[PDB]
Design a protein around this ligand. Structure first.
Ligand SMILES: CNC(=O)c1cnc(N)c2cc(-c3ccc(S(=O)(=O)NC(C)(C)C)cc3)sc12
Length: 286
């Protein structure tokens, strides 16, 4: 395992209401020859939260895939998860800061990798429940990985869905309708979220174009607080949806819209999604 005493803090990478990822240097020989790693820890340890963190760590440990962040180990005294440090960080920040270097063909390469990373999860009956460009990491120009599994749940053997309602704030603007109204999470709800990820990528993370910004405008910025979800549910029930990002090809937007089907069973699989995207990639290549 990794010793507490040998992990040097360098900087904070992410923060939340119950988590944090810091950039650290694991220098066991204290001779500045150790590698830099990412360490995630609970922002406010609660036994409930610690139990989930334990399961999260097992989830990631059971995953080994080119498009999934690598698990390096744990750190015991306050549990700490030691992962590989992807130098380009989140896809959300990367994309926003370097939009001039990333074209549509690249966005589709990232898109395809995310699909293969999600198909892999589904193969283990794992439901991510939190896909968003802020947890997709960039190893390099050409490689992205799903980098966080803090809300990931395993489907029970007898059901094709999982019900859960965790205390606090949820990323509602990425949630499928049945997840908002019924707290139901499945591969299909992951596909709904995937379509929001696709949207994100093609907006190049323009601040006014984010899902929250776009939905709040549709709902009405003069909105309340507990009633926000209620209105969001109505808006999606009447087929209201995120607009086609600027410069986004009609064939890409249709993939997004198909992922955003109210009919849970009518949404495409991650395999077919990879298929259509790779097809489009080729059609743009030659
Ligand atoms: C510049 N390089 C980096 O920044 C970097 C390098 N290596 C990594 N492995 C990671 C992982 C990151 C991350 C960031 C937010 C979330 S999150 O889903 O929002 N969850 C919280 C905030 C509660 C932790 C998950 C993971 S960034 C990053």
């Amino acid at each position: 395992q990794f010793e507490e005493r040998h992990l040097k803090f360098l900087q904070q990478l992410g923060k939340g209401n119950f988590g944090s990822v810091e950039m650290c240097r694991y220098d066991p020989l204290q001779d500045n020859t150790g590698e830099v790693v990412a360490v995630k820890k609970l922002q406010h340890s609660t036994e409930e939260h610690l139990r989930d963190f334990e399961r999260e760590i097992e989830i990631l440990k059971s995953l080994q895939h080119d498009n999934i962040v690598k698990y390096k180990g744990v750190c015991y005294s306050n549990l700490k998860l030691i992962m590989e440090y992807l130098p380009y960080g989140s896809l959300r920040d990367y994309l926003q800061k370097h939009k001039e270097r990333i074209d549509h063909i690249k966005l589709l390469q990232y898109t395809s990798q995310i699909c293969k990373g999600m198909e892999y999860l589904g193969t283990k009956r794992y439901i991510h429940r939190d896909l968003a460009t802020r947890n997709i990491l960039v190893e390099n120009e050409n490689r992205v990985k799903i980098g966080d599994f803090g809300l990931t749940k395993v489907l029970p053997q007898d059901k094709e869905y999982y019900k859960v309602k965790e205390p606090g704030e949820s990323p509602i603007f990425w949630y499928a309708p049945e997840s908002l109204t019924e707290s139901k999470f499945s591969v299909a709800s992951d596909v709904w979220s995937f379509g929001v990820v696709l949207y994100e990528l093609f907006t190049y993370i323009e601040k006014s174009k984010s899902p929250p910004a776009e939905f709040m405008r549709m709902i009405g910025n003069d909105k309340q607080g507990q009633m926000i979800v209620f209105h969001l549910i109505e808006l999606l029930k009447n087929n209201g949806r995120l607009p086609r990002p600027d410069g986004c090809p009609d064939e890409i937007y249709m993939i997004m819209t198909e992922c955003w089907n109210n009919n849970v069973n009518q949404r495409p699989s991650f395999r077919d999604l990879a298929l259509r995207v790779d097809q489009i990639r080729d059609n743009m290549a030659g």
